[PDB]
Every structure is written in C-alpha cells, then in structure tokens.
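Schema walkthrough. Field components (list of strings):
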Amino acid sequence: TWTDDQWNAIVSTGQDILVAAAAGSGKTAVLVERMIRKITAEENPIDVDRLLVVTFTNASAAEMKHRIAEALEKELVQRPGSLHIRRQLSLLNRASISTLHSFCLQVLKKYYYLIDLDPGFRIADQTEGELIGDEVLDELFEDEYAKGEKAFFELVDRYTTDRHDLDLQFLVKQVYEYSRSHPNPEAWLESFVHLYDVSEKSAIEELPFYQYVKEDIAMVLNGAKEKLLRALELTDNFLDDLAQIDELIQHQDDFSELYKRVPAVSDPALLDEATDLRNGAKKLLEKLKTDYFTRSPEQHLKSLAEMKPVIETLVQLVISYGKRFEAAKQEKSIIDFSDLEHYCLAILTAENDREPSEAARFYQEQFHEVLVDEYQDTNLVQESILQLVTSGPEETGNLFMVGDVKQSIYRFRLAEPLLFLSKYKRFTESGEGTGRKIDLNKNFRSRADILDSTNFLFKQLMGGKIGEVDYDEQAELKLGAAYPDNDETETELLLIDLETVQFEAKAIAKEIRKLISSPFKVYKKTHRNIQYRDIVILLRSMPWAPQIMEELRAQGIPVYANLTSGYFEAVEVAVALSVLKVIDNPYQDIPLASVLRSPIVGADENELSLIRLENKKAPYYEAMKDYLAAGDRSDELYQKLNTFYGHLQKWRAFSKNHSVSELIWEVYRDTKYMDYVGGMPGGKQRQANLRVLYDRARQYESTAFRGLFRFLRFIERMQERGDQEDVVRLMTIHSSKGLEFPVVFVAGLGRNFNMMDLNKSYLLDKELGFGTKYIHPQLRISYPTLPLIAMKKKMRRELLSEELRVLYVALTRAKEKLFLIGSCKDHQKQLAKWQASASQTDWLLPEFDRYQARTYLDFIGPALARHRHADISGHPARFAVQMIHSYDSERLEAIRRGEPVFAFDEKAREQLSWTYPHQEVTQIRTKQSVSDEYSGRYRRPAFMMKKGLTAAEKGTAMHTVMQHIPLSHVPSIEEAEQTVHRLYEKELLTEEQKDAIDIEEIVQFFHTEIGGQLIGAKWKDREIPFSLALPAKEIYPDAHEADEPLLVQGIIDCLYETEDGLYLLAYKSDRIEGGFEGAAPILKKRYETQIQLYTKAVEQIAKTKVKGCALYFFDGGHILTL
Amino acid sequence: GVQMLLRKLIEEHKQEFKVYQKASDKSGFTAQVERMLTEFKRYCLEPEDIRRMAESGTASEYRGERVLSEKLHDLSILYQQMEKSLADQY
Amino acid sequence: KEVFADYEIPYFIDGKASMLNHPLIEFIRSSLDVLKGNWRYEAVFRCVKTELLFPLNEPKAKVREQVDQLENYCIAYGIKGDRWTKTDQEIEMENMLNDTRDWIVPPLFQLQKRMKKAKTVQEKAEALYRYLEETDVPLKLDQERQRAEDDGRIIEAQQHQQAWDAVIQLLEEFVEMMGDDEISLDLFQQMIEAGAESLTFSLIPPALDQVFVGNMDLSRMYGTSCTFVLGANDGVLPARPDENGVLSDDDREWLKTIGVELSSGGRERLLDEHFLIYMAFSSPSDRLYVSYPIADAEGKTLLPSMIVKRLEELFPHHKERLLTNEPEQVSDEEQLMYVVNKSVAQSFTASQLRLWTREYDISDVWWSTYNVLMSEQDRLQSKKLFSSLFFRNEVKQLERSVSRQLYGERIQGSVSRMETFNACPFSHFASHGLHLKERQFFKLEAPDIGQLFHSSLKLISDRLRDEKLDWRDLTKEQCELFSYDAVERLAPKLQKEILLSSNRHYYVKEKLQKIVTRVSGILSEHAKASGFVPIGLELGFGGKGPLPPLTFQLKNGCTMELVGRIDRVDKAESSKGLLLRIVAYKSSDKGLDLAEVYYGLALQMLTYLDLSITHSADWLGMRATPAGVLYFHIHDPMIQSNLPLGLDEIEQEIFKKFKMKGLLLGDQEVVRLMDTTLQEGRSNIINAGLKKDGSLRSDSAAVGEKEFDLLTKHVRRTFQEAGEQITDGRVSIEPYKCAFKSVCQFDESLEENEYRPLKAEKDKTILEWIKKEA
DNA sequence: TAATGCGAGCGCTCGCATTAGATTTTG
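Field assembly_structure (string):
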C-alpha cells in the first residue's frame, strides 16, 4: 500500500509539483512508481524516452533504472502479450536518467555547433583546470604590472600583503568562481559597483544591505532587554539600564538617531549571577556600538563612495581573467564543469533583440515530464536550465521536484535552498491554479525514540532566521516503522569534561563494547548482535579521524575512515615521489638520500655518512658514484649502492620511451616497494596510497601536459595548495546522506563551528555582491565597511542554519540507537548557561541565544534541559545522560631470520616450481611471411629525395611486367613495350616505374631454354599464393621443445607443367655483372632456403612433386637451376 | 591526409556554410566531416546524391528538417569539393 | 598488460599502440614548442632528454650528468628565451655549462631561423626534416635499436625505425595536399600535433600460444574453450548510445523515411547490443565467466548491467564468486590460487604475515608458501621483503670514527646549527653532517628577503656617517630619499637579479622601498627617544672578526668553536655604570619565548648578550650589566580602528606598531633610558610601563639581573650537553610538539617513533625550572 | 576574536595591550 501523500505524489499531474520528502520517506520507491504508471498503463502509455529524470549521482540514476526494470518485467509477466511494455524494457538504456551534468554533456555534443565549442572537447578535472587558471592568471597580472595603470596598483597595494602579491590572485579566483554560480556571470560582476555608488545624501535605511543591519540591531537590543528583564525578576539600577534600552528600541528604525543615542547614553548564586546578565547588556550594547556607531552615518557613506574606483578596477580584472581563462581552454579544446552548465545554458537560450532557443523547444517537446531529485541543492544556473527544458508556465507544466530544505547541507558549494523554499511557500497543498506541494512525513525506516528525539530537539532549535524554516506538523517526522517494542533504545548524551579527542574517543569505544559483550540485538526479520559494521561514528570534520581511529583499534575491531589528504605527508608517497625525482634529475641531495635511507636501499646512517666522506664538495649524487667506482665489490654498502645505481640507469632509460604510469609500475615491481609496504602497520592503506599515485599519473596522461618533469610539478601543485569487513565506520556527517546505521555516534559536539570564513577584509554574497574593508594604503589605515558588517551578520545566521541541518541529517541517519558525545571544561556552569536559555515558553528557543551558538552543544544542551512546560517535558523522548569527569612468539623470531616449522605444504611447493609445458612456443609468431598485420618475416621524404627510382622499386616494376606478359608466344621488343604501356594505362605501373624498365632484359628470358619451355606447356600459372604449415623448430632451431605448426606464407612467381613434370620459376632483380660464373655459387645459396620452402609448399600441399627449379636474372639475363 | 585536405577546403569554402560556419573553426570538426564522407562513400552516396537530399528538406516547414538540409548542404560543398581535388589523381 | 606481465600470462591485444610516448615523436613535438613558446627551458630539456640532441660519440653517461646539472642551473636562474641565444671549481662548472648549451642551442636555434623564415608548408616541413637529419636522429635511433635487441626486446626495437616512417609519411601527405599553401607555425604545429595523436604502431602479430584479449564488437574468435567477459557494469555493457558525428539519431531516423539508408549509429545500435552480447556469451565451448567491478578507477560506485540480472533469471540458483586482493576473504581453496608465481606469492604472503600479527587467524597455505620461499636461493631477497613485518624506522647511532671524520676536528659551532640540533638531532646530521642541498628556484623566498633589509640598513648608516648625520637628524623627506637609493644600489645584485626578471618584482621593489622608508623614520623617532647609543654594529663574532670565537671544552676531545653575527649592540651610561643591550631586526611579530629557550630552540639573543656582557670588560675597559634583548619588527603596518582618526593619531598608531618585544631589565632607570619620553603609563617604544610611584608595571617584560644570568648559564649548559651529543655521533629522530622530512620518513603509527612534547610555560614556571637545575 | 590582567578613577568601573585558544563540509 501507499500513503495518501505518496499516492498524491505518484498520481498527481497537470502542474508543477514540489515534494518535500523527509528522511526515510521512500521517495525513491514512489518516484519509480509514478513513472511506471505513465510508462506502463492501460489508458494512454508513454515511452521512457519522453521523460527527463535528473539524479545527483550516476549510481542513483543507475539504481533508478534497475527498479524501473524490476517492475517492468513484473508488469510484463502479468501482461505477457504487451508489445509496448517489452519496448520500454529496451528504452531504459536510451532513456534520460542521469546527473544534470550528464545531460548537459548530451546537449553540448548535440548542439555544439550553435556556440563555439569543439566537438570531441575534453572535460578537464578540477585539478588541471585550476592549474590552467594559475597560468593564465600569472600572465594577466604580469601584463597589468607591465602596463603600469594607476588604478591597478591602487588595487594591488590595497589587497596584497605587500612584500607579497599572492593574496590578490586568490581574490580574483574567489570572485570569478562565485560569479559562475549566476546565470549571467558578467552582469552579476558589473552589479558590484551599484552598491558602492552612494552619496552622503543617501538614505541608508533604504539601500539593500541595511536589511540585515536592521534585523541585527533588533535582535541585540531585544536580547539586551529580555536579558535584563530577568535581572528584574531576580530582585533600581536595572531600571535605569532598562528604561534607557526601551528608549533605544523606540528608535530602532532610525540609524542616525542611534548614532546619537547608542554611543553616548549606553543568595550568592542568584546575586552574582544577576550581575552577569547585566554585563550581558554591556557586552551586547558595546559590540553594537563598535559595529555600527563608532563613526557617523555620513562617514560610513563617504568611506563607501571612496571605494568605488577600486571596486571597478577589481571587477574589470576578474572579467579580463575570465576571458583569458576561457580562451586558454578553447586552445586546448577544454571545458570545466562550470562550462558544462553554462555552455548548456548558452545552447538552450538563443537571445536576440530572452528566447528559449529551438534547442530548448526540442527538449520541451521531447520531455512530457521532468523529475529532479535533491532539489534543495539546486543552483541558479541549473534551475534556469531546468525551467528551460520544462515546458509550460508554473501554473501548468511538467516540473516535478523532490527534496527537503531541512536536509540541505551544501551551501558552501553555492546551492540555494531558498529556491526550493520560495516555491514551497508559493505552492498550495491542493493544486488550485498553482504549483501543487506535497509532504512526506512518515519515516518507514527508523525507530520511534529517534524520530521523537530528533523532533523534540529541532522543535526548539529550527525556526525563524536560524532555521530559515518553520518547524511544525506536516514537517515533523512521523512513525511508520513496525519495530518491535524493546528498550535501551534511548538517546544517550555523554558529556566529557589535544587530549580532548582522546577522552572523547575512549568514551565512544566504551559503550561500543558495552554493546558488543552485551547483546543489544539489532532488528518480519530476526534479531542479531552488533557486527561492528552496524555502528558508525559521525564527525563533522576529519581532523580527529586519524586519532579516533587509532585507539578504537587499540582494543578490538579496527576502524575504517575514508581519509582524503595527509596523503602527501604519507611516508610511502614521499619516498615514491623521491624515487621519481631522482629518475628525473639525479642531482638532488635530499630526494636522493630519501631513497637511500628508505627500505628500498636501506643504507645506515653510518653508511650514508660513509658515502659523503668520498667527496665532500660534490653533490651527494657524485659522492655516491665516487664510492662505487673506487669501492670494493665484497662490500655490503657497495652492493646496496651498485644495485640501486643499476636500477636508476634502467629507470632513466625506461622513462624516455615509456609513460609516467608505466615508469611507476616498473619501479614498484623492481623495488617491490608496494609489496614491502603492505607488510607494515596500516599497510592496506599504504598500498592504496601508492597505487593512487599510479592512477593519478594515468589521469595525468589524459591532460594537456606530458613528461615526467611536468608530472612532478603537477603533483607539486596539488601539494602546495589543495591536495565486506566488519568495522566501525568513521565518516563525516556530510558524507552520510541516504546512508543509514542501526547505531550512530555523533561526537565532537562540544567543539566550535568553523566561522573562519568571517575574518578577512572581504566577503562575497549572492544578493549583496562584493563587500570589503575600507583600506587606505598611503595613510596605512583600514576598518570594516557597513556592507561588510551586514554581510557578516547575514552570513553568520545562514552558516548557522546550515549547521543545524548538518545536525539534522546526522540524527536522521539512525535506525535504532543514537549516541551524542560532547565536551567542555566545567559541567555545572554550562548547565547554568543552558538553564538561562531554557526558560522561555513556546518551544522555539530564544532567537538570539540560538544565534550566539558556537558549538553543537549549545544547540542540544539548552534544548535538552527543559525535557527532564507541560508538552515539552512530557514529550515522548527518552534521553540517557552521563556526566563524565573525563579522568576515569617463536614464528616471528623465526621469520626475523629463517623459517618456521602444514596442510598445504605439498601443493604450494609444486605450484611454485611449476612451468608452462608449451612455454617455448608462446613467443613464436603464428604467421611468417616470405617476400597483412598478423604476420612477420632512413627513408627520405619524396619531396626532398631524388627524382628517380631505387634498385628495389625498379625490381618491383621489372617483376610486375614478367607476370603480365602474354605467355601465348615469344614477345618481341615492341610486343613487350605494348605490355609495359598497358600496365601504365591501367595503373599497375607508375610513370617512373615505366621509364625504368629495361625491355631487353625482359624479352631476353623468353629466348632462353627455360623461357621457351614456359611458352610450350600444357598448363601454367603465375603469382601463386600459398600457406604452408611447418613444425616450429623446422624454422627455429633454437626452440626445439615444441612441435606446434607455424604458417610460412609467400608467393611462387611461376609454375608450369610439361610432359616431363612440374617446374618452378622465379625472377630475381639481383645485382650481378659489374663473370656470372662466380656469382652463381653465391646467388644459389642466397635463395637456396627460399626455393626449398616453395618446393615443400607445393609437394606437401599438392601432393605432387617439383622436378627442377629455375631463377632468371635481369642483369645479363642469366639462369641457374636448382 | 583527407583531414588535411578538408581543413584546406573548410578554410576557403567556409563562408558558404548555412550552419557550420561557426563550427568550421574547430579542429575537431575536420575529423567529424572526414568520418561523414567515409560513411557517404561506404553507403554509395555521391556528392550529387547529398546535394539532392539537401534540397529535399529545403522549404518544407519542419524545423530540424530545415536545419538538417542546411548541414547536408555544407557537407555537400566539402564533399563535392573533395572529390574535385581527388579527381582522377588520388 | 601490467597484471598479465606479473602473472606471466602471454597474450594478444586487438588494438594498436600510440607513438606519443616515443622519443622521436616527443623530440619533434617539444622542438616546435621550444621556438613557439619562446624557448621555455622546460621544453628545451624535454628535447634534450629524448637525447636525440646528444653529441655524437661522447659517452652518454657523462652527458646526462651534464644535462641534469644544466637543468638545475636553468631552474634556479630562470633561464628562458633570448638568454639561450645570447677558479678551480668555477671553471670546471662554467666550462661544462658552456659546452652543454654549446651543443644544445645551435641545432635547435638554427631550426627556428629556417622555420620562422619559410612561408609555405613544404619549406617548413623541409626545415623540420633537416632538423632531424643534421642531428642524426636516424643514426642515434638505429643505435638504440640494437640496445633493445641486446636486452631481449625486439618488439620495442621494431617500433624505432617504424616511428621514423610514420613521421616521414606524415610530412609527405602534408606537403602533398597543402605543400605549396602558405602557413605559419600556429596552424602548422597544430596539424603536426594532430598528426602525432593519429600515429600508430604496427599491430603485434599473434603467437602460437596466447590468451586472446580483444573487444566485444568486431573481434573474432574460433574454437575458444573459456571466455571471460569484462566490464559488465551499467551504462557500460549495453553501451549507452554514443553521442558523436555530424548527424543525430533523429536526423538519421528521419532520413530513413525519405528512402535513404545510412549507418545505424543511434538507437539501432542499442538493439544490436543484445546480438553482440549473445555472440559473446555463446563464444566459449567449455566455460563462460561474466565479471563486473564494484568500485571505480577513482572509487565511484559501479552497478552491474541488466545482463547480470537477465542471467540470474536464466540461472536463478547460480552463486556468483568474489574476486579480491584480500585472500583472507575467501576459503583455503581459492587462497591456493594466489601462489601462481614467486613474485605474486611474495607480495601476498607479506600482506598475510602483517594481518596475522594483528591477531587474525590466517590460512596455512601462506605458512607453507613462506617456508618454501625461505628454502631457495633468493631466500635473502624475500627475507628483506618480509623484514617489513617488523619495520620500525630506526636510527643507528653514529660510530666514533665516522663522526670524527664527518663532523671533523673542531666543531665550528653556529648558534643556528645548535638550534637545528635542538630542533631534531637528525636534521643536524642531514644539513651539517651530509651537507644536503635543496634544488634552488627562481622564486624569492621569505628568508633571503630579510638579508635585503639588513644590507639596506647597514648601507644607510654608511651614508649617514658620510654626511656626518644621525638617524635623529633625519627628516621625513630624507628618510624616503635615503631608503630608495639603498635598494637601487642593492636590488640588481640580489637573488639572481630576480627583482629585475619580471614586472611584478619591480613592483615588489618600490614595495621593499616604502617599507624601508617607514622603518627609517621609525628608527629616527626611536633615536630621539632612546638614550642607548649603538656601540658596535654587525659585530664579527667568532671566526675572522672583531671578537674572539667563544670556545667549548667538553669530555672526550670535544672542541667547539662557535661563530656568529651580532646585529646591534647599544650602550647607555647609568648611575649603575655601563649598560649594554642587543637589538636584532626581524620580520616576525614576537621576539622571545622563554619556554622556547628552555628546549634550546631560541638561543640567538641570549648568547649574543653574554659575549657583549663578558667581553665588555676587557673590550672597552668597563663592566656592563644587561639592559636586555630586543627585537625590531621591520614592516609597513596596517592599523585597524573603529575610532575615526586624524593624521595626528594615525602617526601615533603606526608608531606603536613598532613597539619592541623582548626581555628587559626590571628597574626604573633602564626603562627610562630606553624610552626617555615615558614619564607615567605605557611606553610605545619598549614593552614596559611606570606606575605613579615610579615603579614599573607587572605587565613589563623586565626581569632582574639574576634571571638574566640564570637564562645565560642555562644557554651555556645547552651548548655543552648538546655539543657533546654531536661528537658522540647522535643522529636520533625526535621532532617536537622540515626540508629533510622526506629523509626522516617519520611515521607516528610506526612504533618507537614519538613526538617529544613541549609544554607552554608561564615565563616564571621555566624561570623556576632553570633555577632548580644547579 | 574574545579574553584576562593591570592600572587607575571611584566591590564598582574604563581603557590599554598582550595572550590564548581553537580551524571544515565536497554528495
């Protein structure tokens, strides 16, 4: 069965539909069912190709195709005689089920000629793409420095940490990358200045950015009052402070008035804690003063209007960059992933004087409906692409989108969930003349306590400006699971208060084994213990991954986290690169030593120093050779070196005729480094690291770069900048997604969020555009600009909403059990801070205190306190808190030298001594010609060479004629010429070949005894091809072992039969006269072996016999018999 | 060698293109045309045959037909100009 | 090719092999690049390292030794473009660097002449060929051909002269079609470039006994017993309709209905997939294997194709096997299939011995395999391999005979060298022991930037004394006028004239200037306030210089003559007598961390002070007391204020940014001598203050003369205990809580390798620890 | 960036200046 909501999503049509699908909604299943209906139904079925389904991975697309299959055959068995359904089964491979990028590509390949894009264009990976960026960038900057424009230096001096210019080009990249998130990048870039164009005559409360200043001031002022009011409840001074504040609240609207007021006017337990709530006022009111009111509204205006010239210079720079960047790609027929979407948008839009081009008209026709998953993570460009292929205005139309804003965790990639959310507010639950929206609340996948815990937390957290979304019913998760009633399913929180991670990782490890030893069996299925693989520990970041992993392996099962970088500081990698470096340029002291001290060579520290002693001034490379040359052979250190120096020269030569990936593999097999590395701690990961180096070289040979040198820099660039088994899976929350686990640990909750984004002298924003500090290079003074502060106030509450959703995906990835591990210093006092926040009724915590949030803890803690004010505490959620003080043999030794002392003892020894019985033949060529690419046996350019022929070519010509001469009778000199000419006419002979023929030497043969015998014959044939099978050794005496037959293939020039027997005839253009008496013996055995093969070929194959063989020679017209 | 020739033809005759005028520039367009001509020969379609087809779609209003004929037209130019430089001596 | 090579499985591949990796193809390509990109040294060496440019008859060995050293030279000096076309140690070297470029430049240079010269194709095509012939590409190739055969590789030997034919023909057709058409390198090269990509080696002829590895489309087979089908993944096997060509599938589909039949190409091909899959599946007589990878080259997920499902429909009870490089995941039987070869046996068995020690029960097939490998000739090799089982990166102590001849007779110490040893004993051994060098680059590093400021400061003084002027007498005008000249006289001679190499650097010039100009004005203001007058400047400490070397005597023949550099020593007369202090110019923010001094990471200033103090006696004829150690921050600061300021207050804020950090003496006088402007409150010149009573504030970085001699003596003991360890030949690897890190190979997971912790200490805490020492 | 110190002015306040203390997420 289905839900009414799922039913709605499945069958609803006639307009755009937005499906808000909560975690475990079974959206996938309903998505499949929907298409299945339209495709396989009685009324009016449609083909799969008439649908457009976009997924965020090709894997999910592929999985989409499989279910669509599964159900198709099912519907096919029930309707065995359906021609249409069987056809659909064939369309799944041609159908459009893919990522948007995968679609864009299909579009570019089809309509490439509409823009300027090379077919067979190549998509560069994000690495080389940026490598090309740095390149064109350096070119641009150099040009600007050299051009000496005044404005440019003003920009440089201003944004560069002078003594250094690096910081500037990052800003340019940063800005450029941002603009690409817009349907019209350049326009948006020129939109920058519009903000900086003001006057002291301007209304601040009017312009765009003040919207966030207004709201900021509101919160703080109110947060002050509400923070003071309690001080009043605690029980004259608070009133003087309060009355003043209310006074400020009266003028919240007037920024100019605030500049007048704000700056100027502004039990031992409950007694000393009430002074803190008063200090709160001061602190809040003081930060408010410094932020906005330290300098006049008029001063802020002038400051901004002075920056305009700079902003303009900066903009045109980014634009010039983009142009050069695009040009560089074009040269190399290259596009980015950005280009993929923009070139698609270019094709879909043909604007003249905005027109949905003919290309778009095609897709609007083809696609009866379009389905988009994970819609909350859509960008503006994609959306404008979607609206471009979707046919019809919103009220009608075929746009179908599913997702959940609450699960939007990728805003740092510039995805805009407001797009999804703006439609959700614009759409009605019914479909009356508008977009139909549908909610999927039922979670068929998770246990009750989870949904209750997750629902209880975010009810008090997600909302307003910090949630961006109102948390309510039709939003709250609902129980659909049939999980049997069992306990110990209560959500746990373990508060523990460099070693931080240690105390936190231990605690986690503990209750894990508490789950292992104890049963806690996970579940018409059956119960089963924890396999370790059913428990997962989610971190928000991965600085702790390596540490946590360690001790969680120190006791019990190992830990598997999917590590990203730290790859270049990995020892294996360092050494491997060190080897490649020495192969490139042996003269590198450090890289050379790196290899010599690695297990690859294994030189002692004394041995290393012993080497230097030979030559103290020369590079370490020469010091090494100097040791070799003079050294003695029975020397161990010498043996280590000579072996290495041997490999080096091999690798050196190997690389110049092979690729980098090949050179790498060869080095791995020559040194057995990859094998060796698999035999040491964490060797499994080490081997992988070592083979991703190989794969990266593979990726590298498809790039616009080549050679070993470049590869080194390539990898060097990656450095300088960016870089079934049962086990605890340690991974980031962001990587969880549709993944799920019976038991989930979410740790590091007592740690700060990353706000580093809000530090620098500038910020980028979709709406407000560019924002920066006021900077005067000559006066050496700078300070935050009003837009800058506004952009930070906004960005802080948008970053915070994102984190709350990151925490929302974490708790929802749980099936049965949830563990929350946080950390701090003083337990009680924070619970007192938590108490302070937990007072206000209405469920949704104070909008300001949630704003002040820093650690995940500050979200949970207070939202948790009130629990264990009727429904709040009474809410069916189970929590378990724990306050933690945070303080509480022979075989190896045999292996170390010799061997130990089994069931397979006998088999193993045989297989290692085994050889291939027929191995001697495995290298021998099957077909061997005697004169097709399957057989075996200083040229100058024709334009720079002689005007004539070579002995070879002449001979080839001389040969052709003999084989075309009529054998009816003896030709005369002219009868021969006629033939030669006809061969010329029919193009069996080149003009050169024709003029090269010596007719006398051609007619001469037919006057010989042999010639006349050829003429007179019962039967004749020429140019006779043959294939003879011989035992392999009969040709190769070297390999005697195997008797397999090989094919010798050639052409017998001539054969003729008389009343005597069959005779063989061959013509040879061999050089003779320069007597022939003395050449005969030599010629005889130059063609000796060849003629025997012929006779053999004839005698063995024809089962007849060849009596006599003759060879005619054009030089003097000579004949010898064999 | 055919592509080299083609790149020469796609130069001069470029401005007679109804569709690929912009795509003629690109070096990956020569290989695409080279492949199309091969197919034309293998399937016994002479330049005269393509010209013929090109004006079968000319002036019959189904967009996609019009475009198709326009590309068949450009190909026709290169096709018949290739056969003209390969005539009798290649 | 790689796998079967290791598993010793002979094979035959349908496809041909590209020539883009062949020296001849590379040599040509990179040659055009040489003259196109205006002689980028990267391209030049790309050509020279195909060694087709190599001199004739000269032993290649030495040639590569020279080519490499020439490369290193060009990398550090940024040699590019025109720079090419334009005693004992020096000669040898520079007499190589000329010879090398002397045979490299001409053949490649004379080529660009002919090239940029010729207008049409044939003549540019001709110029290229003459570049090949005059360099004897044919000859040098033919030679290489032999080496390949001598080493048992005839297949590789064939491809050489075979490569030559490809190029020549490439030109013939080029000049045949567009020969007399006019063209210049831009399009010319691009055409040659596409020519290379198309080039192909001859198909390798089949052998009598091989595994046939081919495709699933136009490959043909006969009498096959066992057939393996690879890549049965989704979107792969039923190959998604390829999108290529000039005509879409709609165009072709349409054409059909007009009575014209073309190649299928679009959706028909997909219908034809099942026939080809059917022909592949029915190919073998005995066995059929259908396999699909789960992961991806990079690790993305891969699903099986619908065919596997269709197969599981016809064979619903068939189990599917699991191919894995982790033997422990399979039964003892399959585990016996890994021992096919010695190499592969070794590779796997090593990985098994590892996992076993991890308390996992491994199959006995590997123990049997182990004992076999230990019973044969190369037992040693496998022994070295298996030694990985217990590989703790371990450092053998330096013997006595080694360290004595390595480090030498006298250990001529350097404060920095001592810091280095105290940072990591191994790092010392790497730099001063083995004398290792980093490849030098054309980049201007941060360190050698400071050397500029010094040499500018030192230069300004000389100018001042010449005009009989002092920093105090300077005007804002002169401060700029003087600073700029200083860089002018220096800039050219700094770091391979890199400041003159590009345009960005000549903007870095005036930058380095504006900074010096501000610091010059700061020193002036500092001098009009300070009562400390500079005694000596850039004082020769140790070796050959003003002072004597400070010597160290330690047990077991330990002679340490350490040398150094004293930036500045200043003198001030007080009622307490003579006062001395040291000032060192830095680009950093802070100067002294007492915690950092305990472990001997910062010995610079404290050691400089001692000498000045000690020798002060027999030096000038008076006894000195330490005023302290100071660090001057050379920079052009940017102030950040929410308070609107006038140029008056801005000058102040900028001024305070140069407040000196360090360690002072804790008396009212010394403070007032270093800042005579200060009466009450904070000083902007030095980190100290005064309460109304005349006592200095607690915030003061000042300490008693006792604590100074305490820190002093501690440092003395540090040069001692660390001076002996060196002679004792200690190379231990012990980083704290590097350029030689790739030699260190420090691995924390690998046991016995530990990070020796350093604690963050309230100055007094360690000030207390050093108290307890003696 | 807060966040303590340390001085004053007058158990409260400001104001100056240095110190500490942690820091990413890539379907």
